[PDB]
Amino acid sequence: IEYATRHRARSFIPPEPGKPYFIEKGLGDRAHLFGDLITIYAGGEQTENTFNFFTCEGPKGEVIPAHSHADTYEVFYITQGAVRLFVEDLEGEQHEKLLTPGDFGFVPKNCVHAYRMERHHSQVVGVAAGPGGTFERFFESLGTPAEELGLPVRPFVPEPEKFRTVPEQYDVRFRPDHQWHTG
Amino acid sequence: IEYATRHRARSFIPPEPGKPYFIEKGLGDRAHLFGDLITIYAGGEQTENTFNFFTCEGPKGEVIPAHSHADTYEVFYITQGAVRLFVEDLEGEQHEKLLTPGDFGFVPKNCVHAYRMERHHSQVVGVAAGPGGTFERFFESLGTPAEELGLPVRPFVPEPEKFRTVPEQYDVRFRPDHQWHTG
Ligand SMILES: O=c1c(O)c(-c2ccc(O)c(O)c2)oc2cc(O)cc(O)c12
Ligand SMILES: O=c1c(O)c(-c2ccc(O)c(O)c2)oc2cc(O)cc(O)c12
Ligand code: NI
Numbered sequence: 198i199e200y201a202t203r204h205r206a207r208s209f210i211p212p213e214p215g216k217p218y219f220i221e222k223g224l225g226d227r228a229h230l231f232g233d234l235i236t237i238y239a240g241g242e243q244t245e246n247t248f249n250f251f252t253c254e255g256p257k258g259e260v261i262p263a264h265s266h267a268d269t270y271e272v273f274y275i276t277q278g279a280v281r282l283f284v285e286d287l288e289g290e291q292h293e294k295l296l297t298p299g300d301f302g303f304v305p306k307n308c309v310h311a312y313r314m315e316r317h318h319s320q321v322v323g324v325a326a327g328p329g330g331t332f333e334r335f336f337e338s339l340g341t342p343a344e345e346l347g348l349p350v351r352p353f354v355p356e357p358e359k360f361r362t363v364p365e366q367y368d369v370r371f372r373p374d375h376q377w378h379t380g
Numbered sequence: 381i382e383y384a385t386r387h388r389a390r391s392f393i394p395p396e397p398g399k400p401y402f403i404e405k406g407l408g409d410r411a412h413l414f415g416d417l418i419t420i421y422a423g424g425e426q427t428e429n430t431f432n433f434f435t436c437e438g439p440k441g442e443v444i445p446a447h448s449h450a451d452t453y454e455v456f457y458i459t460q461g462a463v464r465l466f467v468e469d470l471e472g473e474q475h476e477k478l479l480t481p482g483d484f485g486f487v488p489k490n491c492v493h494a495y496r497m498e499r500h501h502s503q504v505v506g507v508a509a510g511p512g513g514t515f516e517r518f519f520e521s522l523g524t525p526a527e528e529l530g531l532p533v534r535p536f537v538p539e540p541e542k543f544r545t546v547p548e549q550y551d552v553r554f555r556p557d558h559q560w561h562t563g
């Protein structure tokens with residue numbers, strides 16, 4: 198049976214801290230953002246705002262917007278398909294790598310980065326957290342929560358206003374002028 | 381690409397915090413504990429002691445020792461095989477679930493728990509962290525660090541004294557007399 202939480206009328210994440218739980222494949226809290234489906238299995242409420250756990254999956258596509266996080270560190274661990282990760286270090290040097298399932302990428306705070314899914318229905322396991330809390334409700338805030346299972350039929354394109362206001366609540370800084378010179 | 385660190389003569393985890401990095405499948409810092417191989421991709425040094433990221437893989441086996449963590453929350457995210465997760469909640473009710481790849485289990489602090497791998501070379505993605513810091517160097521401390529790739533050839537059984545002294549440094553509390561009555 199399911200739970201009612203702060204985030205969903207129907208969720209498999211228990212609302213109270215301190216409760217163990219299991220969630221079958223795909224049934225975490227879901228959000229749509231562009232063509233991608235984000236699925237949250239644990240958030241800050243579960244971990245005293247220490248860490249989170251979520252997956253991101255999507256169609257073969259182009260790079261997501263280049264961005265950074267001032268106080269948040271991010272893991273990319275590939276589970277399906279192939280994902281090209283772009284990252285610029287603090288010294289301005291850029292790096293790219295095609296990550297295949299079981300490969301790992303790590304993006305520290307203040308490092309500009311982006312990714313491109315290079316196979317249909319690629320999937321990434323992510324953790325996104327830091328001294329300033331956990332990041333997981335970003336996705337449904339800029340994008341939209343989803344009740345349906347599976348990849349969105351139509352991409353969810355946030356209205357411009359969302360891109361201005363979501364940084365006020367979530368640790369994200371967009372870098373639309375950023376150019377990748379790794380090819 | 382390879383570094384000497386506080387933890388290993390050779391590592392693909394950079395010693396300097398704030399550096400982006402990639403690690404190919406299997407090439408995180410490795411440790412053996414019983415028949416299992418633990419591979420660390422990010423530790424507390426990478427995240428200001430906020431979270432970590434590791435895998436655990438091993439043969440079809442019996443349940444690991446029942447234990448709890450006083451300040452640490454743990455994620456079980458199955459990537460290969462099938463893994464049965466046992467957990468006792470704070471009110472003493474026990475639960476078990478066979479978790480298959482893509483399935484998720486969450487064990488809050490102070491819940492007694494254990495797992496059993498039920499396919500050869502099953503694999504779990506883990507995060508284990510909390511207000512008490514990050515847990516990942518526990519495995520090489522009770523077990524042993526490993527330079528070679530692959531499952532350990534001989535199980536590493538820790539001497540009884542390590543079970544007494546490792547809890548003084550890592551957030552783990554063994555429950556040697558704990559009995560699972562879930563099936
Ligand atoms: O800022 C973003 C972000 O951080 C993540 C992300 C995805 C997978 C991970 O594994 C991870 O650690 C982070 O996705 C995004 C997707 C967007 O369309 C826009 C974004 O701004 C982000
Ligand atoms: O205390 C332990 C522990 O926490 C974990 C663990 C394993 C995979 C995970 O994904 C995770 O979150 C935790 O494994 C163990 C394995 C042992 O042989 C003995 C232990 O004492 C632990
Ligand atoms: Ni990001």
Ligand code: NI
Binds near residue numbers: 447448449493
């Ligand atoms: Ni544990």
